[PDB]
């Protein structure tokens, strides 16, 4: 019932550098830093070109290295949470053969934006890669190990692109190398991030908002559920094919270009589940907008109803809660001082994000804990920068 240590960039640099000395023989040239996510609102419209409102965490991913003139990827990781091997050695994608997916998985993220990196000429590099996110426990560690490769690629070889193109490019890498085609949010937070601030993004216009996001009265809370059911990774791309239908029924573009009347109106051109899948996209992406507006003029209130409505929505109508995050909620939710409260990322498993009075935070975690049928994990985060660079 204590939120867990957050190690500042400074530290885990200071890691990194000590484990790449150890493992190469020389200090590294480069260090980068991308951090991972956690949505506040607007769950499962990112890929529906909806609105999300992400803010970056303290939790991130570092990566300090140095050029090869050899050709090849040396890499290690000190994240005992990975699979193994902790090393990892290839040559450079060619014209002739390039990069697959395979083991040790963690790999996996780094060949994919390296694959897919669009600025030539690429050298090889050596480099090592430390975590504070925690292992596929909803706040997306791949994207901050994604956009820290891509930040680290652009030390090597810059790009002359948009932050847009370089999380589409990070995208690219989780859908084809790591086999789970997320939308554009988590990679977008993690470049974009800025200390003290949420980003609103248009998944449409990829137009973004720095939102001020700091009153120290206000605190934001991540409950993680140390649970993930298989379906987290079965059922993602299941919700992706039944919102594209609904939208291909309905003659849409996509579910942005849809409201509840509309989609009410043609009830008959879709599945009973259809609908609900459609339900909660037109209804979250509203809520998103509110909950924007209600962030603006500092109403914490309306922001927190407003969360607890996403929840329910995604609970009944999308149908990617469960149990262990559906019992977080309502456990978070009666606690004086708690404005709201919902499970973030994906569903099935990970976290919850709760907003509540900062002088309640350690009432809502002894309480959190002792409804909690498991074991959860605690953060306190205000809002954090995205992807950066330290020279060495
Ligand atoms: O199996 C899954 C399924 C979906 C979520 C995904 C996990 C794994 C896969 C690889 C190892 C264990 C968990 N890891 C990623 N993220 C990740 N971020 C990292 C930063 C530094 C080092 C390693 C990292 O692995 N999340
Ligand atoms: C998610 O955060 C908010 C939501 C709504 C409103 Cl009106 C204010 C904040 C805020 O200023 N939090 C302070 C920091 C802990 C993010
Ligand atoms: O809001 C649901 C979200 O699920 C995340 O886990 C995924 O990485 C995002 O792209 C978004 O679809």
């Not at 820290?148 to 070889?157: G, H, I, K, S």
Request: one cysteine or more; proline letters at 6%.
């Amino acid at each position: 019932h204590a939120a867990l240590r957050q190690p500042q960039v400074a530290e885990l640099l200071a890691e990194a550098r000590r484990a790449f000395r150890e493992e190469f023989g020389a200090e590294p040239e480069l260090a980068v830093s991308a951090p991972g996510r956690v949505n506040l609102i607007g769950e499962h419209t990112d890929y529906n070109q909806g609105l999300v409102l992400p803010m970056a965490l303290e939790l991130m991913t570092v990566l300090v290295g140095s050029p090869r003139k050899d050709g090849l990827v040396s890499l290690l990781t000190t994240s005992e949470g990975a699979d193994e091997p902790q090393r990892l050695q290839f040559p450079l994608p060619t014209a002739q053969r390039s990069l697959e997916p395979g083991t040790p998985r963690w790999a996996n993220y780094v060949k994919g934006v390296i694959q897919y990196y669009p600025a030539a000429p690429l050298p090889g590099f050596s480099a090592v890669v430390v975590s504070s996110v925690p292992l596929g426990g909803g706040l997306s560690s791949s994207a901050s190990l994604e956009v820290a490769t891509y930040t680290f690629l652009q030390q090597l070889c810059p790009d002359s692109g948009t932050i847009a193109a370089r999380a589409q490019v990070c995208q690219q890498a989780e859908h084809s190398f790591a086999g789970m085609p997320c939308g554009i949010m988590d990679q977008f937070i993690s470049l974009m991030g800025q200390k003290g601030h949420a980003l609103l993004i248009d998944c449409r216009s990829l137009e973004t908002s720095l939102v001020p996001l700091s009153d120290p009265k206000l605190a934001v809370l991540i409950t993680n559920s140390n649970v993930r059911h298989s379906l987290a990774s079965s059922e993602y791309p299941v919700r992706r094919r039944q919102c594209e239908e609904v939208a291909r029924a309905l003659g849409a573009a996509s579910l942005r270009e849809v409201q509840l009347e509309e989609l009410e109106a043609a009830r008959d051109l879709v599945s009973k589940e259809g609908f609900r899948r459609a339900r909660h996209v037109v209804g979250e992406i509203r809520r998103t907008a509110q909950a924007a507006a209600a962030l603006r003029r500092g109403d914490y209130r309306a922001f927190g109803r407003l969360m607890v409505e996403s929840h329910r929505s995604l609970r009944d109508d999308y149908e990617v809660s469960c149990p262990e995050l559906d019992q977080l909620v309502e456990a978070a939710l009666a606690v004086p001082g708690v404005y709201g409260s919902r499970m973030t990322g994906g569903g099935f498993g990970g976290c919850t994000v709760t907003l509540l009075e900062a002088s309640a935070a350690p009432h809502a975690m002894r309480h959190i804990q002792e409804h909690y049928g498991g074991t959860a994990t605690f953060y306190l985060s205000q809002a954090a920068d995205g992807a950066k660079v330290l020279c060495l």
